[PDB]
Amino acid sequence: GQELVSLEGHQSAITALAFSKNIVVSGAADGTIKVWDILTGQLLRDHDGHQSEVTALQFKDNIVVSGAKDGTVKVWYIGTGQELVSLEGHQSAITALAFSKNIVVSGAADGTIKVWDILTGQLLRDHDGHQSEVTALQFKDNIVVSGAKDGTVKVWYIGTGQELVSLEGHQSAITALAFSKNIVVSGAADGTIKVWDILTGQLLRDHDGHQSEVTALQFKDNIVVSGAKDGTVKVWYIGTGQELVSLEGHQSAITALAFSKNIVVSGAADGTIKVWDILTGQLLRDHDGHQSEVTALQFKDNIVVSGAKDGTVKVWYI
């Protein structure tokens, strides 16, 4: 249960992290994107990247979509780093990326949401979306669910361009959300969690949460993992709001979360990285992973990839 490989990382803070198969894609605040080999620890290449801070990364199959602070959205081949198609991108900072099938949905800090076709790069839908910075973006089955810094949550159907239903949203900035079937679940920075009906719009469940000022959220099935500034990492049920397991959490602000099967990984602002099993509540591992705030976590098949504010990228084994 140690590190699998040693990666050099970046010369500036890690701001985006993606992990697929045995390849890690990392973006830094200086615009640099690096492609790593998890099996050999060597970097595949230095991507020419963006001239601005990489803000989001999407890595699916062999195609990675990267957005930056200058509004560019690039689609390129993981094997060569070569641009596959040119997207016009947004005029404001890219703040959210979603990637499903051959469609890319990008959110911006001005509230705009654009829908691209990675086959032609043509702009499919370019709506104003929100009057606030888009903070969350989930896209599945030609349905886009977006959240914003003002607490608004919207549901669009790609192609039609209009909204399917209207949701009351939250009184606080959206931190994460998810959706499937009849249910849209969203979480705001004030700890509230709201479960919506994708066709009715009714607030089916409205919980105030068990923390004040949550920083990270994660949804897997009907279970929420919430990290807060006071260091508390909590696991509770979407249906009733009852807590499902007691974890001690960190003594520093939670800045990153990861959730896969029965294992929750949390990063804190002091660099510590703890790993629990959600069933037994037992701390599988705790480590001072980085000397700086953990800013991104990726977890696939008992492998934890972590990014930090000093630019270090590390690969852990469960």
Numbering used by the authors: 2 to 319
What does the publication say?
Ika8 produced two crystal forms in space group P63, with one or three copies in the asymmetric unit. In one crystal form of Ika8 this axis is crystallographic, but in the other (and in the Ika4 crystals) it is noncrystallographic. In all crystal forms, the Ika proteins assemble as trimers which stack on top of each other into pillars.
By computationally reverse-engineering the duplication, fusion and diversification events in the evolutionary history of a WD40 protein, a perfectly symmetrical homologue called Tako8 was made.
